[PDB]
Amino acid sequence: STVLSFCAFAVDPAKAYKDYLASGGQPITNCVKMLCTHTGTGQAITVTPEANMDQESFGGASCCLYCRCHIDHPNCDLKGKFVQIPTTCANDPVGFTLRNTVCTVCGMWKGYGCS
Amino acid sequence: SQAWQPGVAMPNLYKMQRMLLEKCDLQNYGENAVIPKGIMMNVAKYTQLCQYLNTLTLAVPYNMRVIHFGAGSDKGVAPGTAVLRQWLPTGTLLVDSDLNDFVSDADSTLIGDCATVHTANKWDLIISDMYDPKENDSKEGFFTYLCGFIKQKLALGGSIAVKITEHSWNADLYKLMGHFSWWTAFVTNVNASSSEAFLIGANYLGKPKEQIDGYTMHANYIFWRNTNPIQLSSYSLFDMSKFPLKLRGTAVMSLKENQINDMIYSLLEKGRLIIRENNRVVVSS
Ligand SMILES: Nc1ncnc2c1ncn2[C@@H]1O[C@H](CSCC[C@H](N)C(=O)O)[C@@H](O)[C@H]1O
Ligand SMILES: [Cl-]
Ligand SMILES: [Cl-]
Ligand SMILES: [Cl-]
Ligand SMILES: [Cl-]
Ligand SMILES: [Cl-]
Ligand SMILES: [Mg+2]
Ligand code: NA
Ligand code: NA
Ligand code: NA
Ligand SMILES: [Zn+2]
Ligand SMILES: [Zn+2]
């Protein structure tokens, strides 16, 4: 509810979100889920929706903590693109992108679709 | 048959009438109902809009320019912009705007009243979801700016889709629909119980093709909606295989007024030409 301010006014916004969740707070809502075929490449971050049968596709900016909190990025990789999130994890897309990393060779999420 | 469509267009029979203005029997609020789980109404709505726009002769240049007004939700995100980004060719310039701050997948996002939005450059497609919550007169505000923007900054051959409702409408905008090769009022199947529609102008000609009276045409629109109930449908959302806007590689030419002859107007009408400059795009304020 005040999750965005909570993280925006923390020294470490990513840690703040983790702490907030660990305390029972509800994940950031209104990540923009797209209608898609579910026949895509299954890669993590793409120019258009690329969800496979195990993923959802979301508008990228809405799944970025730093975009959503309107604060500085730690460098955006997501804004302007689409992010594929495992369906089992689609309840917390912002959390997923924070906790996970894209493999630099296959382009899929490490520990989910990556080989 | 109708349930499978992304929505319903105002039939010509109804456009041709000279109806008196009546109250609309529809309410814009509902429980919808046909929106799939985890999907925002606006994602569904814009998806069906783009599905409908796919059936029309839209000019699609190699370096397309699209501006999206009223792109911010009260959620602080841009679901319509996201759909547009999914729909449009990769590398299309997509610029959006809203009075209030929001996070967007557009290339540029302009915050402030739309009247502060200034650009010398012309556009190939204008989308507007702008809306402000005794008589039912023509509304000004953002509509006044929008008509000026279409007249000054829409490329010949370009198209528009502008959201209207029973009470949120403008007479001059309706009149301007007669300056396109074709126009309609389009109701999305997912929001069909609302008086909402998109005024769609296909292939801008920069001059009257027909003489539309704005007050009369809105009365015609309302009469149509009052006498033709449309059952909610999300059928079209379940096949997204052919969704992206077709890459037509539509010619872009900078032509003077005296070069725009009969043959050229015919090309404009058929969705086969865009007329504008190709200078660097600057949008600000
Ligand atoms: N005069 C004006 N100038 C700029 N924006 C306006 C306006 N009047 C209304 N609007 C905008 O129109 C929007 C109505 S809701 C639009 C929803 C948005 N298209 C989405 O994808 O979710 C509001 O965001 C409001 O800020
Ligand atoms: Cl976390
Ligand atoms: Cl389609
Ligand atoms: Cl057409
Ligand atoms: Cl008329
Ligand atoms: Cl051609
Ligand atoms: Mg035609
Ligand atoms: Na067009
Ligand atoms: Na209304
Ligand atoms: Na009149
Ligand atoms: Zn970001
Ligand atoms: Zn890998």
Residue numbers in the entry:
A (entry chain B): 11 to 85, 90 to 129
B (entry chain A): 2 to 134, 141 to 292
Paper excerpt:
The nsp10/nsp16 crystal structure shows that nsp16 adopts a typical fold of the S-adenosylmethionine-dependent methyltransferase family as defined initially for the catechol O-MTase.
Alanine substitution (Y96A) abrogates interaction whereas a phenylalanine (Y96F) increases both interaction and MTase activity. Strikingly, the absence of the hydroxyl group does not alter the topology of the interface. Wild-type and Y96F residues superimpose without significant difference at all atomic positions (not shown). Either Y96 or F96 is in direct contact with nsp16 helix αZ, which carries the catalytic residue K46. The nsp10(Y96F)/nsp16 differs from wild-type nsp10/nsp16 in the SAH binding site, though. When compared to that of wild-type, the SAH occupancy is much lower (∼0.3 versus ∼1), leading to poor density definition. We thus attribute the increased activity of the nsp10(Y96F)/nsp16 complex relative to wild-type to a stronger equilibrium association of nsp10(Y96F) with nsp16 than that of wild-type nsp10 with nsp16.
